[PDB]
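Support case: calcium ion complex. Customer-provided input:
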Amino acid sequence: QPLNKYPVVFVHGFLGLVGDNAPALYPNYWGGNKFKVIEELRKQGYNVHQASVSAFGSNYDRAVQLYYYIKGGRVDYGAAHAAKYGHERYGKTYKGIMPNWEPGKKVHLVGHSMGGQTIRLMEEFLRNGNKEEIAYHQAHGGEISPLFTGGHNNMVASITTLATPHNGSQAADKFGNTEAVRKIMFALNRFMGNKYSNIDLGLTQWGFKQLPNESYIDYIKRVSKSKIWTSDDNAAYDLTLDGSAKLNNMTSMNPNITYTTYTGVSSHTGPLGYENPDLGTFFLMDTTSRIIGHDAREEWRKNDGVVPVISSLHPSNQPFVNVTNNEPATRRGIWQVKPILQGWDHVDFIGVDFLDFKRKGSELANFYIGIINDLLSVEATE
Amino acid sequence: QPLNKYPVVFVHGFLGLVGDNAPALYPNYWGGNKFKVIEELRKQGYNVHQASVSAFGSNYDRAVQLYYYIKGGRVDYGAAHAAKYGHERYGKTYKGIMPNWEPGKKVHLVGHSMGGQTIRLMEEFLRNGNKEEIAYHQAHGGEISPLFTGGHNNMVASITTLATPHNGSQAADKFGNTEAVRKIMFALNRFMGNKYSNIDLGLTQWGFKQLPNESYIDYIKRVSKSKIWTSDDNAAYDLTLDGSAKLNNMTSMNPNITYTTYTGVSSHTGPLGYENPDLGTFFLMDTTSRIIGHDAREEWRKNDGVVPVISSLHPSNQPFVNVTNNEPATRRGIWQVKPILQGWDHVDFIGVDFLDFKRKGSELANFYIGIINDLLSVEATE
Ligand SMILES: OC1(c2ccc(Cl)c(C(F)(F)F)c2)CCN(CCCC(c2ccc(F)cc2)c2ccc(F)cc2)CC1
Ligand SMILES: OC1(c2ccc(Cl)c(C(F)(F)F)c2)CCN(CCCC(c2ccc(F)cc2)c2ccc(F)cc2)CC1
Ligand SMILES: CCCCCCCCCCC(=O)O
Ligand SMILES: CCCCCCCCCCC(=O)O
Ligand SMILES: CCCCCCCC(=O)O
Ligand SMILES: CCCCCCCC(=O)O
Ligand SMILES: CCCCCC(=O)O
Ligand SMILES: CCCCCC(=O)O
Ligand SMILES: [Ca+2]
Ligand SMILES: [Ca+2]
Ligand SMILES: [Cl-]
Ligand SMILES: [Cl-]
Ligand SMILES: [Cl-]
Ligand SMILES: [Cl-]
Ligand SMILES: [Zn+2]
Ligand SMILES: [Zn+2]
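Agent response - structure generated as follows:
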C-alpha cells in the first residue's frame, strides 16, 4: 500500500508539544503553516507519524517513551534508573503506532534538535540494552523491559537529524541549565500539573500531577520534596556540552543504519570575529544566538540561533563524511553530513518562523520530500 | 525654565493607548523601549506632553478631545454633531495641560499616523469654527464650545506629521473599514466597556459603558441599538481614501503655521512591479502592506506597512515643497516634505518594533532631537 515499506517517525525536540497535547492556540510543530509535514506526506501516500514524548524530560526518559510510543505499552523507565534519580518507575501507557515492531520490521527515524539525541539513545538500548538495569535485574530478580535487554537489531533503518545539538550548546550551559531558569521550567511543569490541566509537559514521573482531591498548597508542598529540583535527569542538563558528551561516549555506530545530518547557519561575522544573529533568525533565539556567537573558542560561534555548527554537523568523536546535495545518501555506518543550509535557523527546519518570508513553504516541502527520497533510496539499496 | 518657549504635544494615532490608559503589559507608544520620547526630552529640559484621545473615534471626535486635552474642560462634541451622528454630546472631562491656552500662547503639535489628521482638524476649528454648530446655536440658542466659534488664531506654531495617511489608505478601504472588521472593533469596544474595565478605547459616547447595576445581557441589548454600528463617525472611515479626502477638502493652510512631514518606505519592488514588505516590517502590518503594494494604480504601492507613500508626503490638494535633511524647515504656510526614511515602517517612527535590530535606539533619539531642533528653529525665526 504505502510508497515507503518502513514507516517514518518524526521525533520533536525540547519544549515540543504535538498533536492532541498542545494548547488551544499553538503552532504546529512539524511544518508550521508552511508545509504540513504529516498531513501532506500522507496525502502523497507515505506512511508517516509524529511521536509525542517528554518536552522537558531527559534524553533517557524520552528514549524510553519513544520506544513505547512506537511499540505500545506502559512506559517502564527501569527500576535502577528510577531508584537512582528518584522518580516513578512507571509512566504513561501508549496505544502503539506499530504494535508488531520487532527485528525484521523496521522504522525510519528523523529527529529535530534534541529529537536527534533521543533517537540515537533509543537505538543504543535496542542493540546493547541498559547495563544498570541488566545488572539490577541480575542482583534483585523481577521483570525487565525488553528495551533494556539488548540484542534487538534490524529494527531501525535510518537515523536522520535536523539541527540536532549532537555536541550540546552553550545556550544550555549558560542559560537553559542555570539554577534560576531550571526553577522557572519546573514551576511551569508544576503549574501545568494542576487538576484543570489537559497538557502533559512531560515531568509527571517526578510527581507534578495534582491529585483531584488535593489542595494546591498541599500539592506545592508534596512536590517540593521531589528530586527534580536538583536532578540531572532532565532536558536542560542533557543539552549542555558535558551532558551531550555523555551520550556520545555511550553510543556507537550501527553499521546497518543509514546516518545523515542537516545543519543551519543563521548568524553572520561581526566586528571582532564574533557571530551575531541575522535578521530572520526567529526572535526568541536572539539572546541565545548572541551567547553562542560570542564564545571564546572561535570554531564554536557560527550558530542557527541555539545550536552552534560544530554541534550539529556530527557527534564530534564519531565517523562522518561530508556529502553533496545531489549524491545519494546511502552509506551505512557513517554520519553523512549534508552541506550547511545557509540562512536556515533552528526553527526554519520545522517551518514555524512565520516572521521569515525568505523561508517559503515550497522550499520546506522540497526539503521534506528530499528526506523521504533519501529514505526510499535506503529502502531500495538493501 | 524650558529650552522651548512653546510646549510640544505629541498626538498618537489609531489604536493609540498612552499613559494611565494602557493595559498591564503593553508597549509604550512614544518611543517604545528604544527611546523614551517624553521622559528623555524632559531630562534634557524640553517641555513635552503626550495627548490621550479616542483610539477608535473619528477625527472629529479626536480633534474635539485634543482641544480639551490641552485646554481642560468637559469634552463637548457640539449639539448639532451629536444630533446628526447620534451619540452623546458630552464626554470625558480633562484636567488641562495648558489651562491658559489662547491666542498668543502657542503650542507645537506633532502627530503620528492618524494623529496627523487629528491635529489638522483641530486647528481648522480654532481658526474657522464649525459652521453646523454656529448655525444650530443660532436657531436654538444655548452655549457653544469656543472650539467651534472661529477666529481663534495664533495658537499653534507648528504642525508636524510622522507617517500620517493624509490621503488615506487602501488598508482602510479594503480591510479596516469593511463590515466584518468594523463589527469586531465595535465588539472589542463593547467588551472593554464592561463594569470591570479600567481602559477607555474611546467609543463610550456611543453607549459602550456598562452601567454598574446592568447585566451584560441587557448591556449587549441596550448598545445594539446604537448608531455606531452603521455610522461613519469613526476612525475606520476617516482612514479611507474618501474619508481622508473629505478632511482635505475642508482644510486650508494657515500661513503662520510651520508645516513639516516625514514618511517611511519599508516595501521593495517584486518581479512584476508590485511592492512587498521588507523583512523588518513589523509583522502585524504584513497583510496590509501586501494589499497596498498590489494596488492597480502603480504610484499607490510603495508603503511603510499601512500607509502608501503618496498618502504620507502631503495632503494631495495642498501646497508642498521637497526638503533636504540639512535645509532648516522654517517655511510657514507650506508642507515641507522631508526626504523618505528608507526602511522605516509605520511603527519604526515610534520605536515599538522590538523585532527590528536594524532600527537602533540611538537612531530614533537623533530623529526626535531632529524634530525638537526644527521646532526650536521655528521659535527662533518669529
Ligand atoms: O528555545 C529553543 C531551544 C532549543 C534548543 C535548546 Cl538546546 C535550547 C536551550 F538550551 F537554550 F534551552 C532552547 C526551543 C524553543 N524555542 C522557541 C520555541 C518556538 C515556539 C514553538 C515551536 C514549535 C512548536 F511546535 C511549538 C512552539 C513558538 C512560539 C511562538 C511562535 F509564534 C512560534 C513558535 C526555539 C529554541
Ligand atoms: O494596525 C495599525 C493601523 C494603522 C493605520 C491604519 Cl490606517 C490601519 C488600518 F485601518 F488600515 F487598519 C491600521 C495600528 C496598529 N498596528 C499594530 C499595533 C502596534 C502595537 C502597539 C502600537 C502602539 C502602542 F502604543 C502599543 C502597541 C504593538 C503590539 C505588539 C507589539 F509587540 C508591539 C506593538 C499597526 C498599524
Ligand atoms: C456582568 C459582568 C461580566 C462581564 C463579562 C466578563 C468580564 C470579565 C470580568 C473581569 C474580572 O472579574 O476581573
Ligand atoms: C492589531 C492589528 C491588526 C492586524 C491584523 C492582521 C494580523 C492577522 C494575521 C495573523 C498573525 O498575526 O499571525
Ligand atoms: C502560549 C499561549 C496560549 C494562548 C492562550 C489563549 C487562549 C484563548 O484565548 O483561547
Ligand atoms: C491568526 C490569529 C492570531 C492569534 C492567535 C495565534 C497565536 C499564535 O501564534 O500562537
Ligand atoms: C494592537 C491592538 C491594541 C488594542 C488594545 C486592547 O486590546 O486592549
Ligand atoms: C509570542 C509570539 C508573538 C505574537 C504572536 C501572534 O500574535 O501571532
Ligand atoms: Ca529564520
Ligand atoms: Ca521595522
Ligand atoms: Cl504551555
Ligand atoms: Cl522488541
Ligand atoms: Cl497532566
Ligand atoms: Cl471605561
Ligand atoms: Zn529518568
Ligand atoms: Zn462624533
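Residues 1-382 of chain A form a domain with the Rossmann fold fold (CATH 3.40.50.1820).

Case will auto-close in a few days if no follow-up is received.
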